[PDB]
Each structure stands twice: as C-alpha cells, then as structure tokens.
C-alpha cells in the first residue's frame, strides 16, 4: 500500500510451527503421520519465507540498510535456513532458522525506536 | 495453527491482521484518490479474511470442549468477532476495524487464560 | 459465501469437498503405491481444509443471530463438523470421512429450513 | 476434482461461484456507494476465476474420449463457457452472469447424462 | 494471463512449471530418502496444477475462435496436454513429463504462429 | 526442493503483465474497468515480486553474492519497483521494474555459463 504494519512476530510464529513438527516427527513414525507433517512443514516454511521477504521487501529502507550492511546478508541467510529446515526433520534446522529471525526482530525493533 | 496437532497457535496472528484492516482505513480517511481508494479496498478485503480464517482457526482447531464448557459464551464471542471482522471489511471507518480489534482482545484473554 | 454480503450460500460446497476427503480415504486402502498414498495424503489434507472452510463461512457469513436463537446447539454442531473434518484429515479411516458428512448433513437441514423460514 | 483421481466431480460447484458472480452484478445496480463498487468488482473478479476453474477442471479431469466422442460440441461449448464466465468478469451487466449460468447447465446436462452410461 | 484484456500470455509459464515436474521427476529416480520423496511428491502436484492452470488460461482466455477454426485440432491438443500433465503429476517418470513438455510444444508453436 | 528449474523469465512475464495493465489505462476511463485494472496489477506485481524473491532466495549461492557484490541491493531495488508499479498508473513505472529484472536475468545468465 503500504499501511505501515509489520512485525516479524508473522514470520516467527511460522518457523515456531516448522521446528514444532520437526519435533513431532522424532515421536510418531506411522507413515501417514510422517507424511502430514512433511506436507504442513513444507507450507509452514514457505510462509515464513514470504514473511521475512516482505519485511525486507516492503518494510526495510535505505537508511537501514546504510545502518545495518549486514542486513541483506542476514535476510539472506534466514530464507536459505528456512529453506533447509524445510528439507529436514532435524528441529535444530527449526531452532537455526529461529535465531536467525531472531536477530531480523531485534534490528526490527530498534529501526521502530 | 492446522490441526497435526502441531501445538503452536497464537492469537497475534489474527490481531496482526486485524491492526492492517485498521491502518488502512485511517489512511483511507487521508487521501481520495481513486486508484489509492481502489488499492486500499483490495488489501482490506484479503486482510479481513486472513484475520478471519486464524480467528476461526484458534476456534476449531485449538479451543476444546472443557473450554467451551468454563466459557459458554465462548462460540458466540468467536461469532462475533468473525462477524465484527465481516464489517470492518465492508467499511472504511477505523473504529469498525478497532471493534474487531477488541473483540480479538476478548479472545487473546481467554487464550492466554487457557494457557495458565 | 463472499461476505459482500452477495447472498449466494449453499452447504453443497462443504459437502462436495468432505466427499472428496472420504473418497480419497477409501482409494487409500485399494493401492498400497507409496508415491500414489502420499499424493492422496496431499490431496485429502487440502480437500479437508476446504471443506473446513467452507462450514466456516456458512457460520460466520450465512447464520444470524436469530438463526442461533432458534438453533441454540448451532455453534456447537458446526465447531464438531470443523473438529471431525480435522479427525478425517488426519486420518486413512473413511469412517472419518463418513463422520464428518454425516455432520455437515445436520448442518445441510438447519440451512435449508432458514431458507423457508 | 483433484486429479488423484478421487472420482468426485459436481458442476454445482462452477454453478454456485457463478450464481455469486450474477448475484453481485445485481447488487452493483442498487447501491452506488464507490467503496461497496469495488468491493463488489474484487469479488465478482475472484468468484468468476474459481467458476473459470471449476469448469476447467471438469473438462480435463473428469469428461474423457467416449464423452468426447458421444458429445463432439463438449469441448467448443466448455471453451464458451469459460469465454461467458470472462465476459461476465468484466461486466456489471447481470445479463453476462445469467449467459454464463445458461452454458453451466447445458455442462451439468451433458455431465448428468454421462452419470447414467 | 487474466482476460482484462491484458493482453500479455506467453506458453513459456507453462512450460516453466512442467520443466519442474520433469526435474522432480529424474530427482526422485536418485534419491529414495522418504521425506525427500515426500517433498518432492508436494512439489510435484503443485507445480503440475500451475502448469495446467496456464494452459488453461492460454485456451480460454488468449485462443479465439478465429484460431479454433484454422487450427481444428486445436482444442482436443489442449484437452490431451492437461491430461498428459495430470498423467506427469500422478507419476515419478520423467518421460511422463517429458510428453507432457512435447505436448506444450505443439502449444507453443501454434502460439507463435498466431503471433506471426 | 531444490529441483534446480529457475527463470526470471517468470518474474519478467508478470512484470510485463503489470506494465500492460497501466498502458490500457490510460485508453478507458470507466470507472469499473479502471478498478479491475487495479485489482489484476495488483495481483500481478506481486506475483512478479514473489518470483524475484524465489530467484534471490532459492537460486543465487553465496559464490554469486561474492561475484556480484551489488546483487543483494539490485534484488531490493526491483522489489521496491515492483511495489512502486504496483503503486502507480504511470507505465515508467512499470518500465523500471522490467529494466532491473532485466539487470537480474543477465546476472542470472552469466551464473549458468
Ligand atoms: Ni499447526
Ligand atoms: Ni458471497
Ligand atoms: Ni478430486
Ligand atoms: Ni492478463
């Protein structure tokens, strides 16, 4: 538009769902159950992409990148996270992909201040 | 937030929605231009209905029959509040936008409540 | 089913995509192709989140206060039909399937007589 | 409809999405309100592309060669149907919704038929 | 691609996405890890859908009836290009989606032909 | 996946589509046609934004970064024309949009050599 409301508290509660079925996954083997989870890991990490894309896109200005030159890298380095926790069952690919948005939150919160 | 039972809901995500509703319509308040007007109709629409579709998530899929039974008026808070959201989607004053905002609160209330 | 408002309901919807979910439940015991039960799986789990849809409008955009008078188990039954159409998502069992048409079918008769009435 | 294949076809649901496209044609004509226009226009866009689906997928998932074969007019009349259904995108004429709703029940005779043999 | 008229459809969105159900395809004869089958399962039926969703748009939206008389065949083409990708999406061979990319071949040079 | 299947070709055809869409309103003042017009460049701008994203994500490696060190800030820059386009009525708009994704495809290109 823009309206001017973000927060990536959208892109969070996504990854929080992608590591919670990598940890559902270590305790139920059933084919079916595996299956499901596969398939809700797989669109639970997309969306979080689409999240974190759109602060960068959408939200994130010049003076912050002039204020932050690590901050492409990092945005960059969060979706290729988010794109390895979707290819794996392993919940430390989840929590990887946490902490770098994590890190997007905080510069977030401080570019608010 | 899509019954696994993955565990993970959080009522921010219909709130976060439901602020955008109310952003836009104070900017449309500001400006008249018909093509802005046109494009804060469009994503006040898709807004309004994310919104709707996480409220009515925490509804089927993480509320419980013991929560509907400590809280009776529950279902039809949750009605209302899908209702409210249906309003602020067809009109461009902030405070329809705010009500859905508040009936939201009542819900994130009785969310974090069933968390304690 | 647009919240215009325009009107134009019909339970139909969600009945057609819970078919389906069944439908899909059913072929999964007929063909033990891992490839094939996974496909279905993809399918069976975004026919049910339809079909979930599709309630929800009905109650949110369709039924009205004085329909929630007159049909005071009305939220409860529609909060059962999302919850069954949830159980047949997670689930190869077309009992599952079968549950949660057989709620949208309660659901299909209080429509219909909001429609004479 | 989902190509698995379930085996769970209805044109009631391109019916249903272009009742809702023709329901919001008419109301476009009694209220002139400029918000309530484009709210309108961005359903009926959305409503006449799920119809445009629906008819789509019947065409390529559910009719097969005999129907083919049996109905030789069936594929030029699901191109018309599809066109009837742009057409009526771009209209607020309710004319264009009905046109559109006309070519959907000649589909759901010939698709009743191929139900029976 | 979404009869304003716009005007603008090129085939190459279809063969795009049918280009990657064929590479999923080969992909899953070389791995056979279930999640990565499984993954790779999802992204095949997605990708197909899009495929089939722009050759659809190409038939009912760019393709007139000018084109449907000098070109007869056109029509029962299309027809057999959706099945040939719904035959891709319920299948890991490659040459599934190999016929499928044949078929939006013959699409395509009928295409630019009306463009000529 | 990833699969490997990447053009910014898709980018481009929505980009085009949205460029198309400010041209024919100029021609029709109608005010239903004028708001479809809206509606349909809206849907497409982002569509092409998602297919840049993808690209910037998915497809370029750290070895492309370090290549093309303005990469990460031509990425930014395209999305952020897309969102002006997206914006706008005016085709120059829609034009610098196409002329970045432009700038991304010959990058693109020289990586697959
Ligand atoms: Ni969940
Ligand atoms: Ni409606
Ligand atoms: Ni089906
Ligand atoms: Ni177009």
């Given at each position: ?16 769902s992608?590591?919670?079925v990598?940890?559902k ?11 499901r989870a ?21 939200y994130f200005?010049?003076?912050?990148f ?28 989840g ?7 994590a890190?997007?939150?905080?510069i977030?919160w401080?570019?608010?201040?």
């Open positions: 538009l823009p309206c001017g409301v973000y927060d990536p508290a959208q892109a969070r509660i996504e990854a929080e992608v590591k919670a990598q940890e996954m270590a305790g139920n083997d059933d084919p079916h159950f595996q299956t596969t398939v809700i890991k797989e669109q639970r990490a997309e969306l979080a992409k689409h999240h974190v894309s759109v602060l960068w896109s959408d200005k010049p003076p912050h002039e204020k932050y030159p690590e901050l492409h890298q990092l945005v960059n380095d969060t979706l290729k996270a988010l794109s390895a926790a979707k290819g794996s069952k392993d919940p430390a690919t929590q990887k992909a946490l902490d770098y948005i890190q997007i939150d905080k977030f401080e570019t608010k201040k």
